[PDB]
PDB file of N, CA and C and ligand atoms in Angstrom:
ATOM      1  N   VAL A   1      21.445  -6.404 -11.406  1.00 12.22           N
ATOM      2  CA  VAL A   1      21.769  -5.135 -10.793  1.00 12.22           C
ATOM      3  C   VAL A   1      23.228  -4.792 -11.118  1.00 12.22           C
ATOM      4  N   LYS A   2      23.488  -3.486 -11.208  1.00  9.17           N
ATOM      5  CA  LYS A   2      24.820  -3.017 -11.497  1.00  9.17           C
ATOM      6  C   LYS A   2      25.573  -2.754 -10.202  1.00  9.17           C
ATOM      7  N   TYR A   3      26.808  -3.208 -10.162  1.00  7.54           N
ATOM      8  CA  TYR A   3      27.648  -3.031  -8.979  1.00  7.54           C
ATOM      9  C   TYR A   3      28.422  -1.726  -9.060  1.00  7.54           C
ATOM     10  N   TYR A   4      27.843  -0.688  -8.457  1.00  7.63           N
ATOM     11  CA  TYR A   4      28.478   0.622  -8.432  1.00  7.63           C
ATOM     12  C   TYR A   4      29.081   0.920  -7.066  1.00  7.63           C
ATOM     13  N   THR A   5      30.327   1.334  -7.076  1.00  8.40           N
ATOM     14  CA  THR A   5      31.024   1.657  -5.844  1.00  8.40           C
ATOM     15  C   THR A   5      30.638   3.062  -5.362  1.00  8.40           C
ATOM     16  N   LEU A   6      30.859   3.291  -4.075  1.00  7.96           N
ATOM     17  CA  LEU A   6      30.525   4.566  -3.464  1.00  7.96           C
ATOM     18  C   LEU A   6      30.891   5.681  -4.448  1.00  7.96           C
ATOM     19  N   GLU A   7      31.955   5.459  -5.205  1.00  6.72           N
ATOM     20  CA  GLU A   7      32.417   6.441  -6.149  1.00  6.72           C
ATOM     21  C   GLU A   7      31.245   6.972  -6.987  1.00  6.72           C
ATOM     22  N   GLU A   8      30.194   6.149  -7.059  1.00  7.45           N
ATOM     23  CA  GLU A   8      29.017   6.534  -7.809  1.00  7.45           C
ATOM     24  C   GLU A   8      27.939   7.058  -6.865  1.00  7.45           C
ATOM     25  N   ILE A   9      27.574   6.214  -5.898  1.00  6.78           N
ATOM     26  CA  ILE A   9      26.552   6.590  -4.920  1.00  6.78           C
ATOM     27  C   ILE A   9      26.852   7.997  -4.409  1.00  6.78           C
ATOM     28  N   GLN A  10      28.137   8.250  -4.192  1.00  6.83           N
ATOM     29  CA  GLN A  10      28.562   9.550  -3.687  1.00  6.83           C
ATOM     30  C   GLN A  10      28.043  10.663  -4.592  1.00  6.83           C
ATOM     31  N   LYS A  11      27.977  10.355  -5.893  1.00  7.27           N
ATOM     32  CA  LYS A  11      27.491  11.316  -6.868  1.00  7.27           C
ATOM     33  C   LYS A  11      25.971  11.455  -6.746  1.00  7.27           C
ATOM     34  N   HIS A  12      25.405  10.576  -5.939  1.00  5.21           N
ATOM     35  CA  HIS A  12      23.972  10.576  -5.728  1.00  5.21           C
ATOM     36  C   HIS A  12      23.655  11.108  -4.323  1.00  5.21           C
ATOM     37  N   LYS A  13      24.322  12.206  -3.973  1.00  5.65           N
ATOM     38  CA  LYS A  13      24.123  12.817  -2.678  1.00  5.65           C
ATOM     39  C   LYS A  13      23.387  14.151  -2.874  1.00  5.65           C
ATOM     40  N   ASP A  14      22.265  14.090  -3.557  1.00  5.39           N
ATOM     41  CA  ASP A  14      21.469  15.275  -3.810  1.00  5.39           C
ATOM     42  C   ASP A  14      19.996  14.873  -3.922  1.00  5.39           C
ATOM     43  N   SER A  15      19.142  15.903  -3.943  1.00  5.95           N
ATOM     44  CA  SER A  15      17.709  15.679  -4.037  1.00  5.95           C
ATOM     45  C   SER A  15      17.388  14.884  -5.307  1.00  5.95           C
ATOM     46  N   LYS A  16      17.884  15.413  -6.427  1.00  7.17           N
ATOM     47  CA  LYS A  16      17.655  14.754  -7.718  1.00  7.17           C
ATOM     48  C   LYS A  16      18.014  13.270  -7.596  1.00  7.17           C
ATOM     49  N   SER A  17      19.106  13.014  -6.897  1.00  9.31           N
ATOM     50  CA  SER A  17      19.571  11.641  -6.700  1.00  9.31           C
ATOM     51  C   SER A  17      20.078  11.459  -5.270  1.00  9.31           C
ATOM     52  N   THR A  18      19.321  10.690  -4.498  1.00  8.78           N
ATOM     53  CA  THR A  18      19.687  10.419  -3.125  1.00  8.78           C
ATOM     54  C   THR A  18      19.359   8.968  -2.767  1.00  8.78           C
ATOM     55  N   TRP A  19      20.427   8.234  -2.431  1.00  6.75           N
ATOM     56  CA  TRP A  19      20.290   6.848  -2.071  1.00  6.75           C
ATOM     57  C   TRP A  19      20.766   6.673  -0.633  1.00  6.75           C
ATOM     58  N   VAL A  20      20.743   5.439  -0.162  1.00 10.28           N
ATOM     59  CA  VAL A  20      21.151   5.136   1.202  1.00 10.28           C
ATOM     60  C   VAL A  20      21.502   3.653   1.307  1.00 10.28           C
ATOM     61  N   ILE A  21      22.807   3.366   1.316  1.00  8.89           N
ATOM     62  CA  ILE A  21      23.264   1.997   1.415  1.00  8.89           C
ATOM     63  C   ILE A  21      22.812   1.388   2.736  1.00  8.89           C
ATOM     64  N   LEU A  22      21.950   0.379   2.629  1.00 11.44           N
ATOM     65  CA  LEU A  22      21.450  -0.285   3.799  1.00 11.44           C
ATOM     66  C   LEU A  22      21.450  -1.802   3.586  1.00 11.44           C
ATOM     67  N   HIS A  23      22.147  -2.500   4.470  1.00 14.70           N
ATOM     68  CA  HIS A  23      22.255  -3.950   4.381  1.00 14.70           C
ATOM     69  C   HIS A  23      22.987  -4.321   3.093  1.00 14.70           C
ATOM     70  N   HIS A  24      23.980  -3.510   2.758  1.00 17.11           N
ATOM     71  CA  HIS A  24      24.757  -3.747   1.562  1.00 17.11           C
ATOM     72  C   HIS A  24      23.901  -3.529   0.315  1.00 17.11           C
ATOM     73  N   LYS A  25      22.679  -3.062   0.568  1.00 16.08           N
ATOM     74  CA  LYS A  25      21.744  -2.808  -0.517  1.00 16.08           C
ATOM     75  C   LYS A  25      21.368  -1.316  -0.527  1.00 16.08           C
ATOM     76  N   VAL A  26      21.779  -0.655  -1.581  1.00 18.19           N
ATOM     77  CA  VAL A  26      21.511   0.778  -1.717  1.00 18.19           C
ATOM     78  C   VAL A  26      20.114   0.960  -2.330  1.00 18.19           C
ATOM     79  N   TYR A  27      19.386   1.924  -1.763  1.00 12.63           N
ATOM     80  CA  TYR A  27      18.039   2.196  -2.246  1.00 12.63           C
ATOM     81  C   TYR A  27      17.933   3.635  -2.767  1.00 12.63           C
ATOM     82  N   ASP A  28      17.223   3.774  -3.882  1.00  9.37           N
ATOM     83  CA  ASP A  28      17.042   5.076  -4.490  1.00  9.37           C
ATOM     84  C   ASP A  28      15.680   5.629  -4.119  1.00  9.37           C
ATOM     85  N   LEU A  29      15.609   6.232  -2.930  1.00  6.89           N
ATOM     86  CA  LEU A  29      14.378   6.817  -2.447  1.00  6.89           C
ATOM     87  C   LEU A  29      14.305   8.284  -2.869  1.00  6.89           C
ATOM     88  N   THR A  30      15.042   8.603  -3.907  1.00  9.68           N
ATOM     89  CA  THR A  30      15.067   9.971  -4.426  1.00  9.68           C
ATOM     90  C   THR A  30      13.708  10.340  -5.028  1.00  9.68           C
ATOM     91  N   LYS A  31      12.935   9.306  -5.344  1.00 11.72           N
ATOM     92  CA  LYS A  31      11.624   9.503  -5.930  1.00 11.72           C
ATOM     93  C   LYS A  31      10.600   9.584  -4.816  1.00 11.72           C
ATOM     94  N   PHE A  32      10.584   8.572  -3.963  1.00 15.31           N
ATOM     95  CA  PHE A  32       9.649   8.523  -2.854  1.00 15.31           C
ATOM     96  C   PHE A  32      10.142   9.381  -1.687  1.00 15.31           C
ATOM     97  N   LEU A  33      11.202  10.114  -1.951  1.00 13.09           N
ATOM     98  CA  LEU A  33      11.785  10.975  -0.919  1.00 13.09           C
ATOM     99  C   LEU A  33      10.722  11.895  -0.359  1.00 13.09           C
ATOM    100  N   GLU A  34       9.883  12.400  -1.264  1.00 16.22           N
ATOM    101  CA  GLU A  34       8.815  13.305  -0.880  1.00 16.22           C
ATOM    102  C   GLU A  34       7.629  12.509  -0.332  1.00 16.22           C
ATOM    103  N   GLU A  35       7.583  11.228  -0.711  1.00 17.41           N
ATOM    104  CA  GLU A  35       6.529  10.357  -0.262  1.00 17.41           C
ATOM    105  C   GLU A  35       6.837   9.797   1.123  1.00 17.41           C
ATOM    106  N   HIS A  36       8.018  10.159   1.620  1.00 19.06           N
ATOM    107  CA  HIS A  36       8.460   9.688   2.918  1.00 19.06           C
ATOM    108  C   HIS A  36       8.034  10.694   3.987  1.00 19.06           C
ATOM    109  N   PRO A  37       7.378  10.154   5.050  1.00 18.90           N
ATOM    110  CA  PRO A  37       6.917  10.977   6.159  1.00 18.90           C
ATOM    111  C   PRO A  37       8.074  11.431   7.038  1.00 18.90           C
ATOM    112  N   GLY A  38       9.264  10.949   6.696  1.00 19.91           N
ATOM    113  CA  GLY A  38      10.454  11.281   7.442  1.00 19.91           C
ATOM    114  C   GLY A  38      10.824  12.761   7.254  1.00 19.91           C
ATOM    115  N   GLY A  39      11.459  13.020   6.113  1.00 20.89           N
ATOM    116  CA  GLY A  39      11.872  14.388   5.795  1.00 20.89           C
ATOM    117  C   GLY A  39      12.430  14.473   4.367  1.00 20.89           C
ATOM    118  N   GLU A  40      13.038  15.602   4.059  1.00 21.79           N
ATOM    119  CA  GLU A  40      13.610  15.813   2.755  1.00 21.79           C
ATOM    120  C   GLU A  40      15.111  16.152   2.869  1.00 21.79           C
ATOM    121  N   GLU A  41      15.508  16.452   4.094  1.00 19.61           N
ATOM    122  CA  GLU A  41      16.893  16.796   4.357  1.00 19.61           C
ATOM    123  C   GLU A  41      17.519  15.764   5.320  1.00 19.61           C
ATOM    124  N   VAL A  42      16.688  14.832   5.746  1.00 20.38           N
ATOM    125  CA  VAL A  42      17.129  13.805   6.669  1.00 20.38           C
ATOM    126  C   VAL A  42      17.401  12.524   5.882  1.00 20.38           C
ATOM    127  N   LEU A  43      16.666  12.363   4.792  1.00 19.60           N
ATOM    128  CA  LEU A  43      16.809  11.187   3.958  1.00 19.60           C
ATOM    129  C   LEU A  43      18.105  11.307   3.146  1.00 19.60           C
ATOM    130  N   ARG A  44      18.386  12.528   2.712  1.00 19.40           N
ATOM    131  CA  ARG A  44      19.592  12.785   1.932  1.00 19.40           C
ATOM    132  C   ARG A  44      20.799  12.989   2.850  1.00 19.40           C
ATOM    133  N   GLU A  45      20.492  13.425   4.061  1.00 18.27           N
ATOM    134  CA  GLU A  45      21.522  13.675   5.045  1.00 18.27           C
ATOM    135  C   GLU A  45      22.454  12.455   5.149  1.00 18.27           C
ATOM    136  N   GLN A  46      21.929  11.308   4.758  1.00 19.63           N
ATOM    137  CA  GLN A  46      22.695  10.079   4.794  1.00 19.63           C
ATOM    138  C   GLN A  46      22.875   9.519   3.385  1.00 19.63           C
ATOM    139  N   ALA A  47      22.779  10.428   2.414  1.00 17.93           N
ATOM    140  CA  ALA A  47      22.911  10.025   1.020  1.00 17.93           C
ATOM    141  C   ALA A  47      24.401  10.041   0.649  1.00 17.93           C
ATOM    142  N   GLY A  48      25.176   9.256   1.371  1.00 14.36           N
ATOM    143  CA  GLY A  48      26.599   9.171   1.129  1.00 14.36           C
ATOM    144  C   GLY A  48      27.226   8.020   1.927  1.00 14.36           C
ATOM    145  N   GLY A  49      26.706   7.839   3.148  1.00 13.96           N
ATOM    146  CA  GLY A  49      27.206   6.800   4.021  1.00 13.96           C
ATOM    147  C   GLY A  49      26.164   5.696   4.199  1.00 13.96           C
ATOM    148  N   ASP A  50      26.003   5.276   5.435  1.00 15.97           N
ATOM    149  CA  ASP A  50      25.036   4.224   5.754  1.00 15.97           C
ATOM    150  C   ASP A  50      23.873   4.839   6.531  1.00 15.97           C
ATOM    151  N   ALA A  51      22.681   4.689   5.953  1.00 16.20           N
ATOM    152  CA  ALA A  51      21.483   5.222   6.567  1.00 16.20           C
ATOM    153  C   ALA A  51      20.821   4.119   7.410  1.00 16.20           C
ATOM    154  N   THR A  52      21.240   2.892   7.150  1.00 17.24           N
ATOM    155  CA  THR A  52      20.701   1.755   7.870  1.00 17.24           C
ATOM    156  C   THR A  52      20.741   1.994   9.373  1.00 17.24           C
ATOM    157  N   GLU A  53      21.752   2.754   9.790  1.00 17.27           N
ATOM    158  CA  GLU A  53      21.914   3.065  11.192  1.00 17.27           C
ATOM    159  C   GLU A  53      20.794   3.992  11.661  1.00 17.27           C
ATOM    160  N   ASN A  54      20.514   4.993  10.853  1.00 17.08           N
ATOM    161  CA  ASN A  54      19.470   5.933  11.172  1.00 17.08           C
ATOM    162  C   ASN A  54      18.121   5.371  10.799  1.00 17.08           C
ATOM    163  N   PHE A  55      18.114   4.566   9.733  1.00 15.60           N
ATOM    164  CA  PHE A  55      16.888   3.944   9.274  1.00 15.60           C
ATOM    165  C   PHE A  55      16.384   2.911  10.291  1.00 15.60           C
ATOM    166  N   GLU A  56      17.325   2.180  10.864  1.00 13.72           N
ATOM    167  CA  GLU A  56      16.996   1.182  11.862  1.00 13.72           C
ATOM    168  C   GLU A  56      16.737   1.836  13.214  1.00 13.72           C
ATOM    169  N   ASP A  57      17.274   3.027  13.369  1.00 12.37           N
ATOM    170  CA  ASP A  57      17.104   3.765  14.619  1.00 12.37           C
ATOM    171  C   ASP A  57      15.620   4.051  14.850  1.00 12.37           C
ATOM    172  N   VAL A  58      15.028   4.728  13.854  1.00 16.09           N
ATOM    173  CA  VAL A  58      13.619   5.065  13.942  1.00 16.09           C
ATOM    174  C   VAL A  58      12.798   3.795  14.056  1.00 16.09           C
ATOM    175  N   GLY A  59      13.425   2.682  13.685  1.00 18.19           N
ATOM    176  CA  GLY A  59      12.762   1.391  13.748  1.00 18.19           C
ATOM    177  C   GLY A  59      11.619   1.330  12.745  1.00 18.19           C
ATOM    178  N   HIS A  60      11.987   1.098  11.488  1.00 16.10           N
ATOM    179  CA  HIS A  60      11.002   1.006  10.418  1.00 16.10           C
ATOM    180  C   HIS A  60      10.244  -0.324  10.537  1.00 16.10           C
ATOM    181  N   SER A  61       8.944  -0.242  10.288  1.00 16.63           N
ATOM    182  CA  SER A  61       8.103  -1.426  10.365  1.00 16.63           C
ATOM    183  C   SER A  61       8.693  -2.543   9.513  1.00 16.63           C
ATOM    184  N   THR A  62       8.293  -3.768   9.828  1.00 16.94           N
ATOM    185  CA  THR A  62       8.782  -4.933   9.093  1.00 16.94           C
ATOM    186  C   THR A  62       8.150  -4.997   7.713  1.00 16.94           C
ATOM    187  N   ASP A  63       7.097  -4.190   7.536  1.00 18.85           N
ATOM    188  CA  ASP A  63       6.384  -4.164   6.274  1.00 18.85           C
ATOM    189  C   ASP A  63       6.943  -3.007   5.420  1.00 18.85           C
ATOM    190  N   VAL A  64       8.063  -2.489   5.852  1.00 19.51           N
ATOM    191  CA  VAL A  64       8.700  -1.400   5.151  1.00 19.51           C
ATOM    192  C   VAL A  64       9.575  -1.960   4.023  1.00 19.51           C
ATOM    193  N   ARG A  65      10.033  -3.193   4.224  1.00 19.77           N
ATOM    194  CA  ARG A  65      10.866  -3.859   3.235  1.00 19.77           C
ATOM    195  C   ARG A  65      10.125  -3.964   1.909  1.00 19.77           C
ATOM    196  N   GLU A  66       8.855  -4.287   1.980  1.00 19.38           N
ATOM    197  CA  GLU A  66       8.037  -4.420   0.788  1.00 19.38           C
ATOM    198  C   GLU A  66       7.690  -3.051   0.230  1.00 19.38           C
ATOM    199  N   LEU A  67       7.761  -2.051   1.112  1.00 20.81           N
ATOM    200  CA  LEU A  67       7.455  -0.687   0.715  1.00 20.81           C
ATOM    201  C   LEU A  67       8.235  -0.333  -0.564  1.00 20.81           C
ATOM    202  N   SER A  68       9.534  -0.135  -0.387  1.00 21.92           N
ATOM    203  CA  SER A  68      10.387   0.200  -1.520  1.00 21.92           C
ATOM    204  C   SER A  68      10.767  -1.065  -2.292  1.00 21.92           C
ATOM    205  N   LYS A  69      10.402  -1.075  -3.572  1.00 21.27           N
ATOM    206  CA  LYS A  69      10.702  -2.205  -4.417  1.00 21.27           C
ATOM    207  C   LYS A  69      11.178  -1.708  -5.794  1.00 21.27           C
ATOM    208  N   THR A  70      10.328  -0.929  -6.423  1.00 22.05           N
ATOM    209  CA  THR A  70      10.659  -0.386  -7.732  1.00 22.05           C
ATOM    210  C   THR A  70      11.706   0.728  -7.599  1.00 22.05           C
ATOM    211  N   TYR A  71      11.729   1.349  -6.419  1.00 19.55           N
ATOM    212  CA  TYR A  71      12.672   2.418  -6.160  1.00 19.55           C
ATOM    213  C   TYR A  71      14.104   1.868  -6.016  1.00 19.55           C
ATOM    214  N   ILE A  72      14.167   0.684  -5.418  1.00 19.89           N
ATOM    215  CA  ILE A  72      15.467   0.050  -5.203  1.00 19.89           C
ATOM    216  C   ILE A  72      16.359   0.295  -6.404  1.00 19.89           C
ATOM    217  N   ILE A  73      17.666   0.319  -6.155  1.00 21.80           N
ATOM    218  CA  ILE A  73      18.625   0.559  -7.212  1.00 21.80           C
ATOM    219  C   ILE A  73      19.406  -0.740  -7.472  1.00 21.80           C
ATOM    220  N   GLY A  74      19.821  -1.385  -6.390  1.00 18.00           N
ATOM    221  CA  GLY A  74      20.561  -2.621  -6.501  1.00 18.00           C
ATOM    222  C   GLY A  74      21.434  -2.837  -5.258  1.00 18.00           C
ATOM    223  N   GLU A  75      22.760  -2.776  -5.484  1.00 21.17           N
ATOM    224  CA  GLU A  75      23.696  -2.954  -4.407  1.00 21.17           C
ATOM    225  C   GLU A  75      25.089  -2.525  -4.844  1.00 21.17           C
ATOM    226  N   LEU A  76      25.628  -1.529  -4.140  1.00 20.93           N
ATOM    227  CA  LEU A  76      26.953  -1.020  -4.445  1.00 20.93           C
ATOM    228  C   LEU A  76      27.933  -2.180  -4.506  1.00 20.93           C
ATOM    229  N   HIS A  77      29.072  -1.922  -5.164  1.00 20.53           N
ATOM    230  CA  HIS A  77      30.093  -2.928  -5.282  1.00 20.53           C
ATOM    231  C   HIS A  77      30.210  -3.733  -3.999  1.00 20.53           C
ATOM    232  N   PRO A  78      30.401  -5.062  -4.146  1.00 17.09           N
ATOM    233  CA  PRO A  78      30.517  -5.951  -2.999  1.00 17.09           C
ATOM    234  C   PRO A  78      31.886  -5.803  -2.332  1.00 17.09           C
ATOM    235  N   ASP A  79      32.835  -5.303  -3.114  1.00 20.42           N
ATOM    236  CA  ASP A  79      34.169  -5.114  -2.614  1.00 20.42           C
ATOM    237  C   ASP A  79      34.230  -3.847  -1.756  1.00 20.42           C
ATOM    238  N   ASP A  80      33.475  -2.849  -2.190  1.00 15.84           N
ATOM    239  CA  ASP A  80      33.428  -1.581  -1.466  1.00 15.84           C
ATOM    240  C   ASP A  80      32.478  -1.719  -0.273  1.00 15.84           C
ATOM    241  N   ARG A  81      31.518  -2.618  -0.433  1.00 19.72           N
ATOM    242  CA  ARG A  81      30.536  -2.856   0.628  1.00 19.72           C
ATOM    243  C   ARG A  81      31.238  -3.372   1.883  1.00 19.72           C
ATOM    244  N   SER A  82      32.278  -4.173   1.664  1.00 17.54           N
ATOM    245  CA  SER A  82      33.027  -4.743   2.776  1.00 17.54           C
ATOM    246  C   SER A  82      34.082  -3.727   3.252  1.00 17.54           C
ATOM    247  N   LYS A  83      34.174  -2.631   2.535  1.00 18.50           N
ATOM    248  CA  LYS A  83      35.121  -1.586   2.878  1.00 18.50           C
ATOM    249  C   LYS A  83      34.479  -0.639   3.888  1.00 18.50           C
ATOM    250  N   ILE A  84      33.176  -0.533   3.817  1.00 17.14           N
ATOM    251  CA  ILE A  84      32.425   0.337   4.715  1.00 17.14           C
ATOM    252  C   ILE A  84      32.428  -0.274   6.124  1.00 17.14           C
ATOM    253  N   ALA A  85      32.995  -1.460   6.205  1.00 17.84           N
ATOM    254  CA  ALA A  85      33.061  -2.148   7.488  1.00 17.84           C
ATOM    255  C   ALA A  85      33.953  -1.353   8.436  1.00 17.84           C
TER     256      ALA A  85
HETATM  257  C1  LIG B 101      14.233   3.397   1.606  1.00 19.52           C
HETATM  258  C2  LIG B 101      13.655   2.905   2.565  1.00 19.52           C
HETATM  259  C3  LIG B 101      12.683   3.475   3.566  1.00 19.52           C
HETATM  260  C4  LIG B 101      11.369   3.193   3.611  1.00 19.52           C
HETATM  261  C5  LIG B 101      10.623   2.239   2.700  1.00 19.52           C
HETATM  262  C6  LIG B 101      10.844   3.965   4.732  1.00 19.52           C
HETATM  263  C7  LIG B 101       9.512   3.953   5.100  1.00 19.52           C
HETATM  264  C8  LIG B 101       8.973   4.695   6.145  1.00 19.52           C
HETATM  265  C9  LIG B 101       7.588   4.662   6.532  1.00 19.52           C
HETATM  266  C10 LIG B 101       6.475   3.832   5.935  1.00 19.52           C
HETATM  267  C11 LIG B 101       7.466   5.466   7.590  1.00 19.52           C
HETATM  268  C12 LIG B 101       6.300   5.233   8.610  1.00 19.52           C
HETATM  269  C13 LIG B 101       6.351   4.117   9.674  1.00 19.52           C
HETATM  270  C14 LIG B 101       7.760   3.823  10.160  1.00 19.52           C
HETATM  271  O1  LIG B 101       8.516   3.095   9.462  1.00 19.52           O
HETATM  272  O2  LIG B 101       8.136   4.320  11.268  1.00 19.52           O
HETATM  273  C15 LIG B 101       8.778   6.046   7.865  1.00 19.52           C
HETATM  274  C16 LIG B 101       9.077   6.903   8.827  1.00 19.52           C
HETATM  275  C17 LIG B 101      10.300   7.448   9.102  1.00 19.52           C
HETATM  276  N1  LIG B 101      11.440   7.170   8.432  1.00 19.52           N
HETATM  277 FE1  LIG B 101      11.630   5.919   6.874  1.00 19.52          FE
HETATM  278  N2  LIG B 101      11.831   4.695   5.323  1.00 19.52           N
HETATM  279  C18 LIG B 101      12.980   4.436   4.626  1.00 19.52           C
HETATM  280  C19 LIG B 101      14.189   4.952   4.902  1.00 19.52           C
HETATM  281  C20 LIG B 101      14.493   5.851   5.876  1.00 19.52           C
HETATM  282  C21 LIG B 101      15.820   6.379   6.140  1.00 19.52           C
HETATM  283  C22 LIG B 101      17.091   6.104   5.434  1.00 19.52           C
HETATM  284  C23 LIG B 101      15.668   7.246   7.205  1.00 19.52           C
HETATM  285  C24 LIG B 101      16.802   8.033   7.805  1.00 19.52           C
HETATM  286  C25 LIG B 101      17.794   7.680   8.153  1.00 19.52           C
HETATM  287  C26 LIG B 101      14.303   7.197   7.614  1.00 19.52           C
HETATM  288  C27 LIG B 101      13.765   7.916   8.627  1.00 19.52           C
HETATM  289  C28 LIG B 101      12.446   7.910   9.022  1.00 19.52           C
HETATM  290  C29 LIG B 101      11.874   8.675  10.141  1.00 19.52           C
HETATM  291  C30 LIG B 101      12.640   9.620  11.036  1.00 19.52           C
HETATM  292  C31 LIG B 101      10.595   8.387  10.173  1.00 19.52           C
HETATM  293  C32 LIG B 101       9.349   9.052  10.958  1.00 19.52           C
HETATM  294  C33 LIG B 101       9.131   8.346  12.322  1.00 19.52           C
HETATM  295  C34 LIG B 101       8.535   9.280  13.362  1.00 19.52           C
HETATM  296  O3  LIG B 101       7.377   9.702  13.344  1.00 19.52           O
HETATM  297  O4  LIG B 101       9.506   9.778  14.086  1.00 19.52           O
HETATM  298  N3  LIG B 101      13.587   6.357   6.784  1.00 19.52           N
HETATM  299  N4  LIG B 101       9.672   5.516   6.978  1.00 19.52           N
END
């Protein structure tokens, strides 16, 4: 996986490209964005910060982890990941 800092993810704050750093692991649900029963403006609404907060809020099933696999992108820089602290 490529270590991209928010400097990049930030550029992925749109429909075409919308990720959500969760558990230090950013996911590219820009594809399954429409396949998500959540929304289209709520998934991207957090396409810049941490969605894990909102993602964990709704309380996603434990079988959701296996859900997104191919969509996954990797994990933003580990140095920047500790910066979001
Ligand atoms: C990329 C990973 C994600 C996957 C694989 C995923 C998967 C799912 C699935 C299968 C549902 C149905 C069951 C459930 O989990 O409640 C759902 C619902 C939902 N998801 Fe996600 N989700 C993801 C990320 C997010 C994020 C980042 C948000 C927003 C912060 C979000 C918000 C919601 C909401 C609001 C619901 C609908 C629950 C209800 O009826 O109120 N999800 N998600």
